[PDB]
Amino acid sequence: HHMKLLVIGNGGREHALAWKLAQSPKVETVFVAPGNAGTAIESKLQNIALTAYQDLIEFCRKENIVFTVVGPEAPLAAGIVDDFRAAGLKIFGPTQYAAQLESSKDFAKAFMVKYNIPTAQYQTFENADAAHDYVNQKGAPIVIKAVIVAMTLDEAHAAIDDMRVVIEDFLQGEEASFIVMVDGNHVLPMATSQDHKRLLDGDKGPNTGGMGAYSPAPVVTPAVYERAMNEIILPTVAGMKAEGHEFTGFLYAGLMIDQSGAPYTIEFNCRFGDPETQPIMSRLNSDLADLVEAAIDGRLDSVKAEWNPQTAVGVVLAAQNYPETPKKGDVISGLDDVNRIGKVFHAGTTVNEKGDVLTNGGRILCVVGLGDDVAQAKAKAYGALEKISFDGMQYRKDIADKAINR
Numbered sequence: 100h101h102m103k104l105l106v107i108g109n110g111g112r113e114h115a116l117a118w119k120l121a122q123s124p125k126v127e128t129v130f131v132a133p134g135n136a137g138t139a140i141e142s143k144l145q146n147i148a149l150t151a152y153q154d155l156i157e158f159c160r161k162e163n164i165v166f167t168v169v170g171p172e173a174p175l176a177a178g179i180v181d182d183f184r185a186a187g188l189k190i191f192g193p194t195q196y197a198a199q200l201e202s203s204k205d206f207a208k209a210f211m212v213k214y215n216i217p218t219a220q221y222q223t224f225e226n227a228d229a230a231h232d233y234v235n236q237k238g239a240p241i242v243i244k245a246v247i248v249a250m251t252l253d254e255a256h257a258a259i260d261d262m263r264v265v266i267e268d269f270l271q272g273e274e275a276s277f278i279v280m281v282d283g284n285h286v287l288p289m290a291t292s293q294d295h296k297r298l299l300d301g302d303k304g305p306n307t308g309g310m311g312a313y314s315p316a317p318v319v320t321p322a323v324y325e326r327a328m329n330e331i332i333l334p335t336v337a338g339m340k341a342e343g344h345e346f347t348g349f350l351y352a353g354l355m356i357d358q359s360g361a362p363y364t365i366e367f368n369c370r371f372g373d374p375e376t377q378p379i380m381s382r383l384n385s386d387l388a389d390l391v392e393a394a395i396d397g398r399l400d401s402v403k404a405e406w407n408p409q410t411a412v413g414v415v416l417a418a419q420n421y422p423e424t425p426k427k428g429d430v431i432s433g434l435d436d437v438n439r440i441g442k443v444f445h446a447g448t449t450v451n452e453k454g455d456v457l458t459n460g461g462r463i464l465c466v467v468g469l470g471d472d473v474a475q476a477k478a479k480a481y482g483a484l485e486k487i488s489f490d491g492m493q494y495r496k497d498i499a500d501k502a503i504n505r
């Protein structure tokens with residue numbers, strides 16, 4: 100009762116995590132370091148401007164913080180979890196070593212090859228000699244990156260000559276994000292979701308961190324769920340344990356599901372947790388604070404997650420020129436009248452002295468609507484987004500259409 104918690108980061112995923120933690124009747128305050136304009140506005144959320152880990156450790160001691168949750172990759176790769184734990188504090192997130200699973204594609208591919216985790220065949224190349232030899236051995240389609248998706252050997256050999264080259268198998272099918280909580284040994288899967296990482300309607304334009312996601316993702320049938328757990332998630336958790344560096348925290352698995360229902364791992368990476376986390380948290384009925392505490396305690400097998408059966412659709416509003424260097428500093432209008440239509444999660448927003456909310460990053464907002472089916476959830480999300488405006492804003496109008504047409 101009256102617990103105080105700490106969330107590290109400033110993105111839309113962190114807004115959603117802090118907001119959901121604050122729903123617990125047992126939580127009084129969730130501090131967010133540094134937070135954004137959305138977390139400043141939320142009830143029970145308090146932004147704190149601390150960044151140094153020893154400062155955050157003393158803050159936890161000063162305020163009697165029960166536990167800390169870490170969102171983004173950078174503090175994880177810097178060892179925030181190691182530091183907190185050496186200071187005796189409770190924290191949900193991977194150690195610096197275990198975070199390599201999400202922060203180094205070399206470490207992850209090598210790990211996955213070792214533990215026989217399905218993923219794209221992958222090899223890096225010195226000079227064109229063995230590179231052309233490899234492409235001739237593997238055949239097309241195949242991906243050449245230094246990013247050409249080569250449909251023929253001619254395209255692959257051409258891409259090699261033009262361009263250290265990275266040659267990766269092309270994964271066919273449909274993308275899904277498979278997010279799980281891990282306590283080092285046990286797993287508690289979050290609801291499935293599907294992101295839209297291309298910038299523009301019709302999956303055109305450049306790649307992005309994700310322009311909108313919905314949950315559940317029907318491409319992940321019970322059969323696909325079982326395969327993903329059996330072939331990817333459970334062996335990865337067991338493998339990190341067997342390597343002597345258990346993974347703790349949210350594991351963000353990007354999957355490509357082929358036409359046979361076979362899941363292949365794209366990578367484990369933050370880009371499969373935002374904006375995926377937002378609609379997922381909008382569906383979680385359970386007390387997230389209790390789930391996180393059980394995970395920190397190594398007892399995730401003692402708790403369960405229960406979900407609103409309604410679908411949640413989240414639509415990202417982004418700034419002009421994203422995913423390139425974004426236009427910054429534009430006043431955002433209309434945040435006050437969304438009311439019961441939906442929920443607005445902030446990512447790149449800040450407030451100025453006069454109190455206006457300003458764009459302050461690439462992705463600005465994620466607007467989440469709930470519905471009894473995916474069609475209704477999509478209508479709710481766009482209905483809630485309708486009166487938000489800022490100059491140069493961009494968003495896709497086709498979020499979740501792959502689940503509606505079908």
Ligand code: NA
Nearest residue numbers: 308309370373
């Ligand atoms: Na994403």
